[PDB]
Copies of this chain bind each other. A is one copy, B any other.
């Protein structure tokens, strides 16, 4: 709500951040995996590599590259050993492998493969920086403009506008032309100190954000700061903005500097390599390559030059891109940013979002969608206390009407109908046609050839799985495998299919079942993503298959019980969506009642064999 001053603000959010930090530490430290089989290999960069599947857990799918794992050998055929490695490969399903690069090559027990132990190393950095942002916001009233200060504290302040900021032409150099709503967004943002943009799925929030940044960077001296709580989003922004022709720098944490990515050619730590504007540095880097190492002297000099270079590139950049937490990087403190844009601001806890904000924001743009998944908070006490409400949402409650991008370009209209109607008051418009959203070289028989989606009615008993903690449904699993197979045969590719289901029992089971009972080859099914809706947020697929799993009426979790998660689940697909489930178990929740009704009205609630589908006469509600 409202706060009297930044100190009260800090007094409320600090403790929340602490709860969350301690809980997160406990949880991360409780995820040790016991009996791991490891496959050793050699990277082309000469570093030793370890591949290993964690059976008995799905959680390793939440790893980002650069996260560090502690690998120990707890056997008796070799000297007890312990080493740390950084993640270079993150698994896509329950049976997929993690791949890490060790910090030092030897004496890694490369001749033993079994009885290894995997721990996830917990770092307090993110939480430390969140706290630092809160303390800064409290003690330093010049960390944001007076206007934004008042607005953040929920004070009453007359609205304010800036005239004469609009460009002759809105479309940025190198980007598509913007549609009506996108232009209106850019325009409104250029006229205001604080703006909220709502970007529903498929609407081009990235292009719009890149345009905004383009214009802000052209009418400003210092770098524009661009953030997001996830590295994926940040990389996307970085790429569009870069296509703009601006001088863009992608700042990575030092933990993530041995890692490549779609946009690492813009990474700070790569840009300072082989610079002609710093011959001495060249001379040293060269000598750290030809020879193995550098003397103490040459090393100290080397580091000094690296620091100089980093300062130079950061200070002279048009745009700096990094994660919200990344903005707390020491190399960025002692810098100020007038214009800050934060994407996916609805997926970050407020403090996390404040990390970059306290770096001198005078013109702030928050892009997001409060109709989709919000912040993920581990500590239920913390969440219930308020840490689960994004800065976006809180500002919306305080009276700021977000500007919504209206035309969607991702999915076949048939697929956008329901989400549009239920979550966006029917406002979304289709920028692609049915013909545009039909896959080339694809023979698949939809019960309604014009509507690439259906609810496969499936009634089978559920079982308790995951040693008492979860559920599986063999019947639904079988139907999911049948559908998947039919899709692959129709010309689809594993990398373009996605299976969403809330229960780890069903995911583990699906992986095993397809691996040993699938019509086609194991290798095919292994490249298919299987996860809870959380994992798919922010990404798209050609085809999405849902599995609801539950046979009897129930409380529900995941998309079964959360409208936002259902929205996400229903809006990931370009070409086709198939929901495998039991209408009798779902219809108790009003939203699923709406979904089922809509699907039957479209003659697309079905049962029977895949080869010969028929409309279900099923009774529910």
Residues of A within 8 A of B (CB): 35, 37, 40-46, 53, 55-56, 77, 88-89, 94-95, 110-114, 174-176, 243, 259-265, 270-271, 273-276, 285-286, 289-290, 440-441, 443, 460-464, 467-468, 474-475, 477-478, 491, 494-495, 508, 511-513, 516-517, 519-521, 523, 527, 552, 608-609, 612, 614
Contact = CB atoms under 8 A, between A and B. Distances in A.
7 contacts: A40-B113, A44-B508, A44-B512, A110-B114, A176-B612, A265-B474, A286-B468
As for how many copies of this chain the complex holds, the number is: 3
Contacts of A44: 55-56, 94-95, 508, 511-512
A549 to B, nearest CB: 13
Contacts of A491: 441
Contacts of A609: 174, 243
A55 B43 CA distance: 7
A512 B45 contact: yes
A44 B516 CA distance: 11
Nearest to A495: B520
A290 B260 CA distance: 42
Given A110-B114, A265-B460, 10 more contacts: A35-B42, A45-B512, A77-B111, A174-B608, A175-B612, A264-B474, A274-B463, A274-B464, A286-B464, A440-B443
Contacts of A614: 174
B40 A88 contact: no
A445 to B, nearest CB: 12
A275 B289 CA distance: 61
Nearest to A508: B44
B516 A260 contact: yes
Contacts of A552: 276
Contacts of A45: 512
Contacts of A56: 44, 46
Given A42-B53, A114-B110, A608-B243, A265 B464 contact: no
Contacts of A263: 478
B41 A40 contact: no
Contact of A467 (B260, B290, B443, B474): B290
Contacts of A174: 608-609, 612, 614
Contacts of A612: 174-176
A274 B495 contact: no
A512 B44 CA distance: 7
Nearest to A47: B55
Given A44-B511, A243-B609, A88 B265 contact: no
A265 B82 CA distance: 44
Contacts of A494: 521
A174 B616 CA distance: 11
Contacts of A94: 44
A440 B439 CA distance: 14
Contacts of A468: 286, 289-290
A546 to B, nearest CB: 18
A289 B464 contact: yes
Contacts of A477: 265
A39 to B, nearest CB: 10
A495 B518 CA distance: 12
Nearest to A292: B467
Contact of A478 (B42, B265, B274): B265
A157 to B, nearest CB: 41
Contacts of A290: 467-468
A478 B612 CA distance: 42
Nearest to A259: B516
Contacts of A274: 461-464
Nearest to A523: B523
A474 B243 CA distance: 16
Contacts of A55: 42-44, 46
Nearest to A509: B44
A462 B275 CA distance: 9
Given A44-B94, A464-B274, A262 B521 contact: no
A261 B514 CA distance: 10
Contacts of A286: 464, 468
Contact of A517 (B111, B243, B260, B440): B260
Contacts of A512: 43-45, 260
Contacts of A276: 552
Contacts of A46: 55-56
A174 B264 CA distance: 55
A506 to B, nearest CB: 12
Contacts of A511: 44
B440 A262 contact: no
Given A111-B112, A441-B441, A512-B44, A262 B517 contact: yes
A482 to B, nearest CB: 9
A467 B95 CA distance: 37
Contact of A521 (B114, B264, B495): B495
Q: Report which residue of A42, A495, A608, A614 has the largest number of chain B beta carbons within 10 angstroms of its beta carbon.
A: A42
Nearest to A491: B441
Nearest to A267: B474
A14 to B, nearest CB: 38
A202 to B, nearest CB: 15
A504 to B, nearest CB: 11
Contacts of A95: 44
A501 to B, nearest CB: 15
Contacts of A42: 35, 37, 53, 55
Contacts of A264: 474, 478, 517
A609 B440 CA distance: 23
